């Protein structure tokens, strides 16, 4: 009784880095392939339903935060059970992770559909609470395919969590024309076909779980007993992966606050695009951050500290020669790169300086990753804060206020940030490696 993803976890460790980050990169390019075209499409209906968009943004990537947080904390806790083969350790790891998504997927809904109406307080506006009720609505929907996507990810069946986002971005890639211009729907079509897409999603997920039932894992309610050991594995890892999500987003909010005190409404417009370039370069880190939890905490749960090391520093390095190819190609075309997104001059500036944290970066997120995988989800919080909040708000605050060195000055805080939060975080890696050897 054993699958193929099972025998990656269990064989070769940097064997199992390439397998299930790969699967990862091609499934978030196609997602990230799904907001470049949902980019162009919405642009066309006019700046006023375009502003909708930014309105809901924080709130979706609030959904994503604790849907994803579940599923991480999902991933890693089937991750070191099926490394210890406790097989009935993770069946029950799966249940829980079910019957939570509707408690979480519930209480997103019944806390946020009623109060959305008072949390955006013109026609943007407006259209922002069409938007927002038509997602929110199945916001079990989003957690459901997130702890679905964890239990396939935790039991290294990497494929078909591939398949789940090819064919939810895929799917939402050919029913966004349609619903947008083909029909009479505006923005709000595009809310309706990000819905169906997940509808679809889920059928297909359910079918796999319950109606298939070819996982590594058993999903039953037979002698199911909800325990304390099983919930604070999960929230050990789910809750403080929702709250690093969170840092990300006051920290994008506080950099934009620098940014206005520094280039103005220019300013922050050059930030906002130089900090959407970068950020689609950074695709590949998340598909490796992936696999090192997965394959870490496996290696965790054999006791066996040398597999967890030779993981953690073969993610650290693939990541960076990735990194740097990808770096390359946004620097010597950052005049390429600038006029797909619609002063470009001072973008070019950005262009050629912030994509460098892609490169520094790999040595935090691994890090992040390899405390995810041994279910120490605080100390990676505590690196998340130190590097979004610390590190970079911090430097950032003061290359502009005591140096005057204006919108330029805010790339320089980032990468000195990020230089400093990757030492810092090499070196806590490191450290916490060391300890492991000396207790097996």
Known sequence: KTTKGVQLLRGDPKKAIV????????????????????????????????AAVGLFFPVFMGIIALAAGLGVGTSSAIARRIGARDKEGADNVAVHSLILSLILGVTITITMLPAIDSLFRGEAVELAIEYARVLLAGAFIIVFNNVGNGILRGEGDANRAMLAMVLGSGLNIVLDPIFIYTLGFGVVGAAYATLLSMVVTSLFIAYWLFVKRDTYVDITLRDFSPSREILKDILRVGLPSSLSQLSMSIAMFFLNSVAITAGGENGVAVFTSAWRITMLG??????????????TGAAYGERNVEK????????????????????????????????LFTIKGD???????????????????MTSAMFQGIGEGEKSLILTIFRTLVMQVGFAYIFVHYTTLGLRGVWIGIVIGNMVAAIVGFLWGRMRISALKKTS
């Open 19 to 50: 397998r299930l980050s790969i699967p990862m990169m091609i499934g978030m390019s196609v997602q990230t392939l799904y907001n470049l075209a949902d980019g162009i499409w919405v642009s066309g209906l006019g700046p006023e339903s375009l």
């Open 308 to 339: 967890l090391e030779t993981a953690y520093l073969y993610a650290i390095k693939i990541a960076f020669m990735i990194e740097l190819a990808v770096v390359a190609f946004i620097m010597l075309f950052a005049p390429q790169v600038a006029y």
């Open 282 to 295: 950074i695709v590949p880190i998340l598909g490796m951050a992936a696999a090192t939890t997965s394959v």
């Open 347 to 365: 973008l070019i500036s950005a262009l050629r300086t912030l994509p460098v944290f892609l490169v520094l970066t790999p040595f935090g997120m």
